Design a protein around this ligand. Sequence first.
Ligand SMILES: Cc1cc(CCCOc2c(C)cc(-c3nnn(C)n3)cc2C)on1
Ligand SMILES: Cc1cc(CCCOc2c(C)cc(-c3nnn(C)n3)cc2C)on1
Ligand SMILES: Cc1cc(CCCOc2c(C)cc(-c3nnn(C)n3)cc2C)on1
Ligand SMILES: *C(=O)CCCCCCCCCCCCC
Ligand SMILES: *C(=O)CCCCCCCCCCCCC
Ligand SMILES: *C(=O)CCCCCCCCCCCCC
Ligand SMILES: *C(=O)CCCCCCCCCCCCC
Ligand SMILES: *C(=O)CCCCCCCCCCCCC
Ligand SMILES: [Zn+2]
Lengths: 285, 285, 285, 252, 29, 29, 29, 29, 29, 238, 238, 60
Amino acid sequence: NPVERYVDEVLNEVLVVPNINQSHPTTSNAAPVLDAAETGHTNKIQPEDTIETRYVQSSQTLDEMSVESFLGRSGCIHESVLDIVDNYNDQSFTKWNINLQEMAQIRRKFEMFTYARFDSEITMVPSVAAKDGHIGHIVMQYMYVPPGAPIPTTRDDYAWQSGTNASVFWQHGQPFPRFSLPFLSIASAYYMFYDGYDGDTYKSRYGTVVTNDMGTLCSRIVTSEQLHKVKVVTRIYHKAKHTKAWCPRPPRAVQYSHTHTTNYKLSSEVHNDVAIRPRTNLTTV
Amino acid sequence: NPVERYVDEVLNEVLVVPNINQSHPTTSNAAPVLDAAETGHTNKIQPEDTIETRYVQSSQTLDEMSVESFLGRSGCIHESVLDIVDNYNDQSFTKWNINLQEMAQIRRKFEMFTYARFDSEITMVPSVAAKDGHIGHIVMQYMYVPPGAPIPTTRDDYAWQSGTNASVFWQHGQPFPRFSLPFLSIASAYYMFYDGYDGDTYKSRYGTVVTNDMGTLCSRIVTSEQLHKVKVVTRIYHKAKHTKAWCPRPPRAVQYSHTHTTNYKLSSEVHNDVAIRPRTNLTTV
Amino acid sequence: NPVERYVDEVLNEVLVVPNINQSHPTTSNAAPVLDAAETGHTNKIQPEDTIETRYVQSSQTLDEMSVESFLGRSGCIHESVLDIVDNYNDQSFTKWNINLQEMAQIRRKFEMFTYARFDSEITMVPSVAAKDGHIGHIVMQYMYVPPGAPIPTTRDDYAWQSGTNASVFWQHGQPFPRFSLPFLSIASAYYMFYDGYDGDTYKSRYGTVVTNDMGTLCSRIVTSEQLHKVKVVTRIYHKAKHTKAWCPRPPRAVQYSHTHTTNYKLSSEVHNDVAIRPRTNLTTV
Amino acid sequence: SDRIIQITRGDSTITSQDVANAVVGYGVWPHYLTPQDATAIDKPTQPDTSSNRFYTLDSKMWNSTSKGWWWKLPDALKDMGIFGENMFYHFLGRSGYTVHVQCNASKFHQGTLLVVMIPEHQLATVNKGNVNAGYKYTHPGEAGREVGTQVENEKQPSDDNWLNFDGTLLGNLLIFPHQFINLRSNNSATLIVPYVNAVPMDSMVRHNNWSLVIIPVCQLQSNNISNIVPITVSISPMCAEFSGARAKTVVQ
Amino acid sequence: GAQVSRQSLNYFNINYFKDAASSGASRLD
Amino acid sequence: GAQVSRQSLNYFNINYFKDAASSGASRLD
Amino acid sequence: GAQVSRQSLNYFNINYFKDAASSGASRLD
Amino acid sequence: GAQVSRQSLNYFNINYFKDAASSGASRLD
Amino acid sequence: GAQVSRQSLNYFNINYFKDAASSGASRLD
Amino acid sequence: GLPVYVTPGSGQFMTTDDMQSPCALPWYHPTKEIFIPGEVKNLIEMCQVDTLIPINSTQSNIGNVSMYTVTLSPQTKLAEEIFAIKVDIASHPLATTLIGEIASYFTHWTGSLRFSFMFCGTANTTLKVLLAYTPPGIGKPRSRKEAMLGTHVVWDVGLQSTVSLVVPWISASQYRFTTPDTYSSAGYITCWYQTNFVVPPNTPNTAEMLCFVSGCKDFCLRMARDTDLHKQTGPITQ
Amino acid sequence: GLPVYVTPGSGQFMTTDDMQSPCALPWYHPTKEIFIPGEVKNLIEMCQVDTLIPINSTQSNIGNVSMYTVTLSPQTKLAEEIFAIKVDIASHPLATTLIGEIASYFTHWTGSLRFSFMFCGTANTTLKVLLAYTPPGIGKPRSRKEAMLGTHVVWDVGLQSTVSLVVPWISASQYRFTTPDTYSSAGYITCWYQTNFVVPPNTPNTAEMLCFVSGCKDFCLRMARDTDLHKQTGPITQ
Amino acid sequence: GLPVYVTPGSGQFMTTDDMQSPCALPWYHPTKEIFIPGEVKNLIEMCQVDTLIPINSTQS
Ligand SMILES: Cc1cc(CCCOc2c(C)cc(-c3nnn(C)n3)cc2C)on1
Ligand SMILES: Cc1cc(CCCOc2c(C)cc(-c3nnn(C)n3)cc2C)on1
Ligand SMILES: Cc1cc(CCCOc2c(C)cc(-c3nnn(C)n3)cc2C)on1
Ligand SMILES: *C(=O)CCCCCCCCCCCCC
Ligand SMILES: *C(=O)CCCCCCCCCCCCC
Ligand SMILES: *C(=O)CCCCCCCCCCCCC
Ligand SMILES: *C(=O)CCCCCCCCCCCCC
Ligand SMILES: *C(=O)CCCCCCCCCCCCC
Ligand SMILES: [Zn+2]
């Protein structure tokens, strides 16, 4: 019943954990505690098998541990800066080659999977710093330039006409812009990792750069030059919606160094590069 | 079922492409690959006819390629400037002879058809540049003056009363103005091209200027003179809704030079005037 | 069916014009083209009566020509100015004796009828000019003072309490104020013209001033005196709703000179006072 | 045989024993204006067989250097019998056409003509700012225009065949109703086009609805160049009807 | 203030305020 | 302006203004 | 876009925009 | 808080808040 | 999230968000 | 609360919008409506009534009732021209007629026009006149023979004083601009002597004629606009 | 009033949004729609029509109709190469064809392509040619033997002047980028002499060939974008 | 129009909110989903798999 299901949604009780049943003393030639990890399987022994348990009714739910929940939180993926210093025409617009690899927090979470398919929700948080005192009337334009479309080279480039590309205009004072984006890949899922090249020569590129081109985000202050200089910083937040993930993998153990690559750097004292805290010895808790 | 149709809308699966069927080796005196282009018809041969194909279920849709989608994107068609320099009364208002020929991006798309019929959605993006520091309280008036109605000659002209004409007032800080306009032509469709004149003499006008008069857009800063001078730039965006198009034609290959005319200019090195990139020779890919 | 009627509303096809029917050659002693204008009636001859017509299906509608449409457009009827020059207490409030005679555009349209009955929609467009730089926090009060109620004589007059009168407060930055007003006359319809006096002596008043007293609109800047002086101009727009009109009359041919009177002025060259353009002679088109 | 064709219109019959089928522009056969689409209210005059017949224009010579030719309709027929008279005596006119281009050579000749019917072919001027093609130049009559011959004048239209005389590439002309006269295959092209316009009827004096463009895309070559190879065009109005009768319009 | 019609194409002619003057433009004829 | 369908999955194709030009993008085919 | 359930406890799972990407978080399992 | 009447002319006397003081002007008599 | 009652005096106890914490003050007893 | 998405256009004021707004005078009860003769429901009602054309509006006649009359008299040359004007509804001299004035409040027009003429000579004055309409695409006729080839009515003056000529809607487009536009100019109306103005002895040798205009059943105006036939060059004061 | 919660996104203007807005011209009735031949409802209709490939677009040929023809002639060496181009829909010389131009208004493409060739030699000129498509993951074939191992058609010139070669959709991913991208390059099309161009005496020793391209039933474009095949470097004035 | 009362919280952006928003790419049709082994639906699936404990993690 969709209504019962609805109640479960509201209470977050869609996925319930099993109860613990009462167990008793045993004397058997069936030893559940003994097994063989060589098989590559985890011994499914439960508490009732190794001790005498009481009956307990579980009320815990796994809803929050769902992939939708894990990746369904909006996090920052880019900080765009437009700092008017001495040349408005050159400093009033910029561009970014879109990717979800520049911020460690969300990157690490997505990378716990090999392939992921999801729709995106983008929320932008623009903040205008009044460097000289007033901010005037700031109107921003964020244009999505898919790979192939002409990238504007000046603040008045014809490409800004956005005759076909999707543009979002924001007026200072109005609520934060937000829009959704359908799964964009040309494949069935996004590659979080890609053990391949775009060719078979010594100079072929390796990794997700080959498969994950999302195009360019071009921004510009629509307002013409003003007396007082401003510094507009637009923070882009991304959230995954309607998510699916395949083949889980180990979490990133060392810091990230670059986008589209698993490369890392190690110091002379590697224990400083990982989160493992050295133990005094085996018996010191 | 309107509900099933609705689901198709949400999923964008209204127009599905056909599947590829499995084919087999053939030895026949029926040769589909052979035909005669002289007829003016395209040979309808499909992959199954020239190679041995496998069965494949298509999931691609043509929805996005619909005329509604192609022309249903809002693009800039005019940039109105009101720059207060030294005379408020003269510089606080202006007028534009409406047309969709001044911006290449949307112009080229509409011109891929000979006749088009559609309703219009206009969205305006005003940005006030504080030239002297403050912007005060900016209130704008955009009045549509149909051909024949009196055009205001001063910022306080009686025509601004808008006793009958449609005017839109915008207050700085409020969301972007937007309104719709029904198909305006006196004919059944708009002429994208017109091989005709408004008379039969050597001085008769040629082209769409004869048939596409939409009137005038008159703008003015309603606010009276302020201490600090401002520069208001209003960008008009246009989108076609409920569209129909007839007789497709070749896309514009060279830059546009003027409105209402197909005129163009050629340099001494024509290969620079078209998008064709010179080939080294016939066999150099 | 209210739904069918609804569709007609959406398509604007409530009032359709008749078709033209096919006609044929005639030889009769019944001559429709001949009549007698002396009767005061218009000869109802139609095209089918004077030429051989073809059958044509009409798709034109008269909806837009309805009285509701003609008078149902918001036009400016007053421009209220509050200019702070050197005395805030005296210059921060004002009053207007309400009437629809001060702006030619809407006045001329209503005056094409002798009596009219309608409800009113008032929309106000306030614009604050920062004469000295900043505008602070501007809050306006528009109080309707029906004939008889005390008119405030100072910006802090007790009448501003509006214990019974209708007042509208607007805060700068908020959307344009708007409200409706029921048919206000003490009679069954408003007099557009009135061939009468308020007495029978040489000094009795003549015309609509006798019958059309709507009271007073009193405005004031609620905000107390600020450092920076401002100039607030409030433009009042009026639209007729649920309209009825009786006895149509000729349109005003010469400029208006005063309110509540048909008075006019003529120059020595009357052809300059009317819209008639002198003809060279009877046969020069 | 599918190679043969006979087209009869009024008192004229045209044949060809080497055709490449026929094209019906936009798949619509010409027809009279219906009362639902009509706007002018007077009864139309429909000359029938006296106007809906084949009119043969002036022949042109095709040689190794020819760049192309173009005619505009109804302009090309303005001086053709009853059809011509009707277009000047009436304000409004409406008509469809059967265009039959003729060109025979031999089994030892080679060459290919691209025959196209373009609706609203609004010509452009090159490097002349906003000066547009003059009325006189877009109304050559039955003589049509020989591309690359006219001594340039200010109001002279573009003669750039590769840019379709309007700023678009020649290779995409195929999007319009067309046929090819490939000398090894056929000796004629036939296109039947319906009336196409944003209004039900129009002034035939100031608005040219269709433009017939013939561009040789494969140069004429043979080992007997002295033998002249002409191109002849025969056009037949279809369902011609006129309205708004008055005195005869005299142009120029 | 809701005039609910049905045809399904349902019409909702809502009157948001309690005074007749408050409603929009009148219907025709 | 409400086109109410039922399947329950009910569709509400509302037209907020009284002019056809005011509605959004058209359906396809 | 309205999934109207009844139990009365009526559920209204409305989809305000016409693209599936526009909807909120997915249901579980 | 909805007093739904029918006559079709349906009335929707909605009370948006849960305290009687919150409602608008009273009806007469 | 709509608890539609009928008595006609119809009640609409709508829950706009999907978490129980989001709802307003509790009913009494 | 119910999550909402504020759409572009919000807060704007469009003079042609159609929204509702709270009433400033709650509980107020409007004065009872009484029956008043002459209710008008559509402007077409005014376009169907004949009004006089100031056809003789030469600079010297303007400001005189004579600008409304055309004088006829015995001719010495046959088939002479009497008058000629454009059919365009908002062109001069049609502009200030009631139909011209109303058409000037709209941008597009369509339909057939009805032109009537009333002879004012004595009961003993005879005359036959040819009234012609020349569709566009040609200049105004230079002779009666030229005009006669178009739409026309031969008016014989007798007991019935008035005659009507209908200018049929003959256009390429369904509508035309009310403002003078080359593409949409509608043609001309010319009047010529068919025979001659004849009178017995002792009878005035000249007579006047009045000209009227109104719209036929198919007349229709579209796209409301402000008129250019009236202006305000200064404040209107009390 | 009804309690509401203004959501992020409110008041923004997205050029691809789909909202409603009040009509500036209330009561206006649009001109009656009439039938006009040639209605287009989907761009796929234009992608299925053959257009010429400016295959011989060398710098010297550009601006000439000759950029559209390939010349053939008697060979002295066997299996010589005639032409070679990339199959990528928006690469040159395919870019300016109608299908290339339309594909450039989209970011993704999929489907099979149909390449047709029409021989322009005399009726007495014979020829057999091998047209081949080489799937990616290898360089363009260096010889007829190398090309022949891929998809191919052996075209015999005779009564029927035209032949068609279909480039099947052979890709790892369901779609490819229209813009040149290493990962999604689609391969090559090469043409070779199967036998030889043969003519009788007194017959031109060279002949032209025209090349066409259009999309098959499975052709499809996705994700609209602005084209890079046209620009505006200055204002467009009146 | 319908009288509304804007509630506190309006216009704010909470990283954990769950609202709808217009799609920037209307009419776009996502690539067909294919079967891929190894789908994970809940993190508990990963918590139930044995992994090695770096129990002898002395600095050396
Ligand atoms: C894997 C994988 C998936 C993605 C797509 C991230 C979404 O990227 C964006 C962003 C952040 C903003 C815009 C954007 N901003 N403004 N507009 C109009 N579009 C478009 C895309 C595709 O990136 N890598
Ligand atoms: C073909 C063709 C179709 C069109 C009409 C374009 C719409 O033009 C406008 C614009 C851009 C703004 C306004 C406008 N702006 N503000 N108001 C009140 N009206 C009115 C029209 C007709 O132009 N050419
Ligand atoms: C005839 C005729 C009909 C009318 C009434 C016009 C409406 O007049 C007003 C206006 C313009 C504003 C206000 C007003 N402004 N602010 N408030 C609270 N009331 C009240 C009336 C009666 O005037 N002449
Ligand atoms: C009319 O007299 C009252 C107007 C009420 C305004 C509120 C309209 C919205 C009603 C929504 C109810 C949904 C039904 C379950
Ligand atoms: C269509 O013609 C009218 C559009 C009405 C807009 C209001 C839509 C909201 C209706 C809520 C009614 C709730 C039902 C009880
Ligand atoms: C789904 O496809 C359309 C979504 C419509 C949004 C409007 C929802 C509000 C409906 C109120 C109708 C009240 C019923 C009488
Ligand atoms: C009364 O006690 C509760 C008031 C609820 C306010 C919400 C009103 C809007 C209801 C719309 C429901 C549409 C029906 C399907
Ligand atoms: C509950 O789980 C979902 C809450 C939905 C919020 C929208 C409420 C407004 C519903 C109006 C529908 C009108 C009925 C036709
Ligand atoms: Zn300051």
